[PDB]
Symmetry: C7
Subunit: 96 residues, 7 copies
């Protein structure tokens, strides 16, 4: 089990859409890596300058739309790929 | 349904003006993508250093003039293009 | 009608001086774009870190000497060009 | 009349020294533009984070040694050149 | 013995996996340096702007997934290699 | 007379050592410009966020070690060269 | 005698190990400059934004592992080389 520290989130990226809306199969770079993924673990919370810990608004098990960049990192836990990213890199959460 | 986090805003971009003011048809890069778009969703509000959350001055359903850049991000929801951008990237709002 | 957000100003750039001081007509790069323009709209005011919004020192209808750069954006409203710039980009205000 | 806002100063750059100490006339790039100039106008005062405005240490009519760069801007008022620069760009003042 | 100051951690990097999940031996760049390492020493703690020193959330003897970069540094203590990195450079500790 | 503003210091750079410790004459780039120089004038003091002015720890007439760079500026007063540099650019004072 | 101001430390770099663990002599770039050095002088202490001076955690006469970079500087006092570096550039002190 992996749990982050401060404003950091462990997110499992969802599989890229093999088929499009109309039923056509997408292959190669056309079926680009999905930017939404379910949240596996949430850190303790963002640290402020006054010394308090502010809990992250992201909950465990909620699909979130995030951004790939230098902030995000790829890690291998039990032969599975996870993304470690700051809560700021999380653009939004997905509900319903 | 998608809702943003903190200062981020979900905006649907308005369709680029195919027709100019004087009745001439605009095509190609000349009919550039509009910088105005109706706000689809407003985040909980920007977080300050003290720990309080201040609601964003933008409202859901208000057309806003925004800036394209690294901050804004393109996303697909229900087979439709939306932009995720920080409230700072929102230049202004359009009224009347 | 367009009004800005936080510390932003909508300014109407004045026409570039066609003629010089002594009556010489300037054309091309000689009649460079003017850096002074009348303020069309003033935002609510700059937001401080503590959460208080202080009104901008500029006023609607006052000519301001501004700086071109990444901060200023050229938007179009009713086939007319307006510069949206942060109040910091406003170097000075023109009185009398 | 032109006056600045916040921590900005309107300065009139002094004429470059045509002759050196020994009475030799200097021309071209050798007679470089002087970095000293009399202060024409002082802004209201530097903006602080807590919301207070602190008056600038410079005074109108005092010669100041300043630095050229991106901060300083050359504006024309009544066919005369004035430097608009932040108070930080002002290295020092000249007395006696 | 080596101990850090402020928000710095001394970590002993784990050996790179010679064999993969299926017993397939990996060599060269394929068996890249592991981003996990057991924590050897924890500094006194990060210093905030108010002047207080807070303890780090990382405990001595806990494996941490960290990021290699300019912040991390390699040091030779008792003919052994250790990485000195800021607590921010630590991504997530490993439990069970 | 010239005196600085806020966290700035006027220093007179010492003459570059012509002869080394062993009576060997050094010339050209080998006798590089000394980083040591006596303090000629001390500004009013650094300004903090809250609005108070804290006096600089350097004293007038005390030799200091300065780091050349963008911070330091070479001005001329009474045909003599003076370095205007921020107090942060001052490394260490020289006593005895 | 040389002493620093604010968060600065004067450190004498230790001699670079000529021989390795097994008694083999190392020469050239292989015997790289040591990153640990005994502390010769400690500044008054780091200054925070509120105006208080926080004493440095480094004590005089303690060997510290540091980082070479733009922050560190080389100075010649009594025909001897000393590194002037901010306490942030100090990585970790050495005990026993």
């Amino acid at each position: 089990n992996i749990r982050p520290l401060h404003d950091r989130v462990i997110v499992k990226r969802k599989e890229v859409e093999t088929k499009s809306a109309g039923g056509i199969v997408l292959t190669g770079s056309a079926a680009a890596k999905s930017t939404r993924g379910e949240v596996l673990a949430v850190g303790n919370g963002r640290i402020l300058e006054n010394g308090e810990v502010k809990p992250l608004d992201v909950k465990v098990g909620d699909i979130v739309i995030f951004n790939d960049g230098y902030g995000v990192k790829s890690e291998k836990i039990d032969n599975e790929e996870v993304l470690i990213m700051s809560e700021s890199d999380i653009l939004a959460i997905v509900e319903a």
